[PDB]
């Protein structure tokens, strides 16, 4: 193959330089499992029981007795295939476009295949990280003009049926008010019997700046970050609490457990960018190539994610 396909050989020799996704830090090694599927769905069946009425008092004769009902739920995870196209210089034509210290036409922004592939893959990995964090696909800072995704395709920040708290616009500067909302959400969290697990917190840079101020005269020894770690340790049974700062977030705080029983990420084994075999070739020096990647596969339990949004109005 490598004796026939220069593009494949170049991809093999360039794939090393592409950096690791940063979403791996947000999860534990046991929370990520690959699935062999490009486009489609996976299903999981869960059974549950409930009490329909108060229990029946057994005295004298009675045959009308309160019942216990059962239910089955099928959770479906959708996986979607996506593609990008990019232009590059042809391999035979690279010699006429080499320069003193670089290869490529600066005037027309034409690149060799390896460099073009590396840059495109980096951009696609950034988009994948943004999807996994927020559950939306867009290329605008406003966040509008979003791509219409399939149902049951969510991220950590838009997962439904989770604890959501909002800090008022006039209280955005008051870290005590923010911590009040965080404490209310932490109380409302329901971890059940899987509570003993390390916890993960993701914050924006501004909140990270606010966290280093002393706890409120003001305390001379402890900071708001230390108070937050103790508060989360109270509900996770004194397990490790990891704190991360993400520039992707804007005035939002995410708190969730690092437990595979509550939150599990089952991405496709073809999720990360992969070159396509088709190459467009003409009589000119410009060629086109395609990159494929798969989105979807976040599964979470109800009321296990705390999402705090600080209104900036």
């Amino acid at each position: 193959l490598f004796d026939e396909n220069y593009y494949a050989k170049a991809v093999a020799n360039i794939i090393g330089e592409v950096k690791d996704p940063i979403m791996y830090k947000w999860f534990s090694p046991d929370q990520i499992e690959d699935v062999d599927l490009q486009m489609g769905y996976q299903k999981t069946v869960k059974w549950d029981a409930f009490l329909n009425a108060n229990p029946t008092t057994i005295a004298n004769e009675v045959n009308t007795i309160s019942t216990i009902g059962f239910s089955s739920e099928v959770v479906r995870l959708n996986y979607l295939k996506l593609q990008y196209k990019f232009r590059h210089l042809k391999q035979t034509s690279e010699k006429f476009y080499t320069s003193d210290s670089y290869i490529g036409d600066i005037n027309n922004n034409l690149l060799p295949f390896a460099q073009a592939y590396k840059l495109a893959s980096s951009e696609i990995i950034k988009l994948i990280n943004h999807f996994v964090l927020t559950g939306t696909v867009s290329i605008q800072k406003d966040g509008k003009n979003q791509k219409r995704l399939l149902p049951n395709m969510y991220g950590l920040l838009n997962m439904p049926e989770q604890i959501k708290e909002e800090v008022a616009s006039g209280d955005k500067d008051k870290m005590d008010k923010i911590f009040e909302k965080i404490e209310a959400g932490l109380s409302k969290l329901e971890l059940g019997d899987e509570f003993s697990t390390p916890m993960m917190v993701i914050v924006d840079p501004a909140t990270s700046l606010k966290l280093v101020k002393p706890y409120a005269a003001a305390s001379s020894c402890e900071k708001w970050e230390d108070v937050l770690i103790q508060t989360i340790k109270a509900i996770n049974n004194r397990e490790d609490v990891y704190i991360e700062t993400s520039n992707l977030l804007k005035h939002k705080i995410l708190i969730y457990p690092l437990n595979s029983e509550l939150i599990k990420f089952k991405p496709s084994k073809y999720m990360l960018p992969t070159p396509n075999e088709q190459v467009d070739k003409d009589s000119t020096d410009v060629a086109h190539s395609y990159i494929d990647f798969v989105l979807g596969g976040l599964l979470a339990t109800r009321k296990t994610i705390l999402q705090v949004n600080i209104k900036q109005s």
Partner: protein, 154 residues
């Protein structure tokens, strides 16, 4: 309201004859297809299968979609649908098309136009000519072989 027959068939099809075996709603694409045809896909709004489509915009939170329509808003014809992903295959009106399309509830040579629901009707803005007579699939559904070649003047 589905590309493939919704009801599972009650018998095994008889594979003997080769004639008159293509007048089915599951015949996606065109009778004569060129390898140089430009093909797009779009998020589908409704079921525009085998119908003329227009571009529909919302508040702006999500991208634009395509929905059944015609008249001055005609943008292309939908020739295939993927139901799982809700994707409609659109052939732009700037590319000529020849195939079976939905007809409003007509003889070869009649000049046709697209109505507000993406249905072909006998005639102004779009060049469409019927190459056969209406074939009835359902009591309310008819298809006609048609050639659509651009937009005419006036």
């Amino acid at each position: 309201l589905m590309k493939n027959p919704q009801q599972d068939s009650g018998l095994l099809s008889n594979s003997i004859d080769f004639r008159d075996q293509n007048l089915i709603f599951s015949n996606s694409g065109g009778v004569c297809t060129s390898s140089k045809d430009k093909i797009e896909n779009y998020p589908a709004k409704g079921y525009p299968y085998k119908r003329g489509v227009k571009l529909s915009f919302g508040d702006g939170t999500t991208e634009l979609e395509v929905e059944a329509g015609g008249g001055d808003d005609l943008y292309g014809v939908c020739s295939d649908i993927d139901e799982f992903s809700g994707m409609a295959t659109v052939i732009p009106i700037t590319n000529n098309f020849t195939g079976y399309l939905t007809l409003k509830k007509v003889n070869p040579g009649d000049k046709l136009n697209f109505n507000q629901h993406g249905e072909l009707e006998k005639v102004k803005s779009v060049n469409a000519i019927a190459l056969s007579k209406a074939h009835k699939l359902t009591e309310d559904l008819f298809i006609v072989l048609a050639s659509v070649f651009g937009n005419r003047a006036i």
